Amino acid sequence: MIRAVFFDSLGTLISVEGAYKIHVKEMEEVLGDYPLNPRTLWDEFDKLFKEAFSNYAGKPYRPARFILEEVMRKLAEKYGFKYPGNLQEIGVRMARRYGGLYPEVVEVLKSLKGKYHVGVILNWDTENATAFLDALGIKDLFDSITTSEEAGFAYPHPRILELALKKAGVKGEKAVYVGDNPVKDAGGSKNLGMTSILLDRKGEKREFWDKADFRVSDLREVIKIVDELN
């Protein structure tokens, strides 16, 4: 019955502890020798980039590289540090150095890939998203990489999922959907017939429990769930 498994957003693959490290080390490289706290610069930057990026939700996609540069450009002015080019390429380097994938990702992707179409969906730019997956070492494990830039709209928008399924050549009813935030993923409260799996690593997402077919704290359960559905 099931022919494709999709992972939406990097929260289903990267841990909060690993993500925060890459982010911390990201600002470290940006500041260099300039006397600024990387912890605080991340706080203001993450706050500002969220504001700017949220204004495009479900609307025609503007690449994040241009929204990041503007946010970073303003911070450089505010605090008086040089802007060392695009942050996107710095992130790929930090992911290379420190990683941050959940311990079982590569194992789970490897098993599913032998039986089903394993695709990933991201609310990011196509080029950088692929480079980031390569840095983590899981790019070649996916049968398809679908992004908001390719679909033309930011999260949420049906064209993203529609295109992901088009790549796999399967209908939604024959696909599984792994996400970590139902109100911040590609399909929003929409799936196209897909069987949803909510990743709650800590069991602290009660508000999202009732809007997901299955719940798991370990991605290896995605193997069993998909297996039983067949």
Author numbering: 1 to 230
Sentences from the paper on this structure:
Following evaluation of >18,000 clones, a BHMeHis1.8 variant emerged containing 23 mutations. More detailed kinetic characterization of BHMeHis1.8 reveals a kcat of 4.5 ± 0.19 min−1, making it 13-fold more active than our previously engineered MBHase BH32.14 (0.35 ± 0.03 min−1) and 2000-fold more active than the original BH32 design (0.13 ± 0.01 h−1). During evolution of BHMeHis1.8, Arg124, which was essential to catalysis in BH32.1413, was replaced by a tryptophan. To gain insights into this mechanism, crystal structures of apo-BHMeHis1.0 and apo-BHMeHis1.8 were solved. Efforts to obtain structures complexed with either substrate(s) or product have thus far been unsuccessful. Comparison of the BHMeHis1.8 and BHMeHis1.0 structures reveals that the 23 mutations installed during evolution cause minimal changes to the overall protein fold (secondary structure root mean square deviation (rmsd) 0.47 Å, Supplementary Fig. 9). The MeHis nucleophile adopts a single conformation in the structures of BHMeHis1.8 and BHMeHis1.0, however a notable 120° rotation of the imidazole ring has occurred. In BHMeHis1.8, MeHis23 is positioned by an adjacent Trp42 residue installed during evolution. Molecular docking of (R)-3 into the apo-BHMeHis1.8 structure reveals a binding mode with the aromatic nitrobenzene ring sandwiched between Trp124 and Phe132 and the polar 1,3-hydroxyketone motif pointing towards a newly introduced Glu26. Interestingly, a PROPKA 331 calculation based on apo-BHMeHis1.8 predicts that Glu26 has an unusually high pKa of 8.1, likely due to its positioning within a hydrophobic environment surrounded by non-polar sidechains. Instead, Glu26 has emerged, which mediates a rate-limiting proton transfer step to deliver an enzyme (BHMeHis1.8) that is more than an order of magnitude more active than our earlier MBHase.
